[PDB]
Design a protein around this ligand. Structure first.
Ligand code: NA
Length: 348
């Protein structure tokens, strides 16, 4: 992006969260363009699922869900008016409010962050291709703020994570195909930094996560269709250069931190199987690319159950939601959670 703007692959087809009681719940767009959801029924290891239930209305983005600091799930999606809409549990685990508009005009999928004080905050690309944000004005409560611009020129969904100083950093691809980012500070006069380049040539949505020690790390597909990554050399310090983890990935990458405190990345491979690769140590050590097989037609979505094990979801050949999970001793078989999912991604 130019100076004027610096002053402040297949996507996944679901968003997942844990309920206050640990139960996983997934949100996706069905063939009728409505948001549907499906949850674990019991706050218990080895739970069955509910089956798909409709939240009605009309979705034009991938949905995003985040738990409030009072335990209530809240889901966000772009509506047919290209405004941001939301719907929340009125008590932890049940009783959806129904959809209400937060307005704006957004041109990416919305991503959700929770501030250290418990205020939800949503980041999305605007009609002017700048990053915009909107927030709860009180912990787990409306009203929401007006939309505010953070400038920039975005060509991807933004990706956000809390840094070692408890504040958000937001990363996005720009119109030079490089990764740029902004970081929130304590400063009154400059609460957000100006957009800063981390270079690279990126051909997927990027995804940021924290290592167990607070070092932020970003994953993205490169121009060679390999998985690339870049990380902080110490908590809240400067970044490495871009380093290749090789492979050929045919979706956005997904990442989580496993029970060993190691980052583990999932992506679709060129055989349409699910592949994963993980840190084997702190310093400069990853596993080989490893196949979990299956046949998938979306990026994977990774979540973590209340026993601390990773669960992975992806669209199957029949548009059902495929499912595979880490157990105490191995990876499970592939099972289907059914449904009929579309890719309503706003950034495609
Ligand atoms: Na809907």
């Amino acid at each position: 992006m130019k100076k004027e703007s610096i002053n402040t692959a297949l996507s996944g087809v679901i968003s997942a969260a844990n309920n206050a009681d640990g139960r996983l719940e997934v949100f996706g767009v069905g063939t009728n363009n409505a948001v549907w959801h499906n949850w674990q029924t019991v706050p218990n290891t080895g739970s069955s699922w509910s089956g798909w239930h409709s939240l009605n209305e009309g979705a034009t983005s991938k949905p995003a869900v985040h738990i409030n600091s009072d335990g209530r799930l809240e889901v966000f999606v772009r509506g047919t008016d290209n405004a941001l809409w939301h719907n929340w549990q009125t008590v932890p685990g049940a009783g959806w409010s129904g959809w209400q508009s937060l307005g704006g005009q957004i041109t990416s999928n919305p991503v959700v962050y929770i501030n250290s004080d418990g205020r939800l905050e949503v980041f999305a690309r605007g009609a002017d291709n700048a990053l915009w944000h909107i927030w709860q004005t009180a912990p787990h409560a409306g009203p929401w703020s007006n939309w505010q611009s953070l400038n920039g020129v975005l060509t991807s969904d933004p990706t956000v994570y809390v840094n070692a100083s408890g504040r958000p950093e937001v990363f996005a691809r720009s119109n030079d195909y490089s990764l740029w980012y902004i970081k929130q500070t304590a400063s009154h006069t400059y609460p957000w930094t100006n957009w800063q380049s981390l270079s690279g040539v990126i051909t997927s949505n990027p995804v940021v996560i924290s290592n167990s020690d607070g070092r932020l790390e970003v994953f993205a597909r490169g121009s060679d269709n390999a998985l690339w990554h870049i990380w902080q050399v110490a908590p809240n310090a400067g970044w490495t250069n871009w380093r290749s983890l090789s492979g050929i990935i045919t979706s956005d990458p997904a990442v989580h931190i496993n029970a060993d405190g190691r980052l583990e990345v999932f992506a679709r491979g060129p055989d349409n199987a699910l592949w994963h690769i993980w840190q084997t140590a702190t310093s400069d050590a990853w596993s080989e690319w490893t196949s979990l097989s299956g046949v998938i037609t979306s990026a994977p979505t990774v979540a973590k159950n209340s026993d601390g094990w990773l669960e992975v979801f992806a669209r199957g050949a029949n548009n059902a939601l495929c499912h595979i999970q880490q157990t105490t001793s191995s990876w499970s078989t592939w099972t289907s959670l059914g449904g009929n999912l579309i890719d309503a991604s706003a950034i495609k």
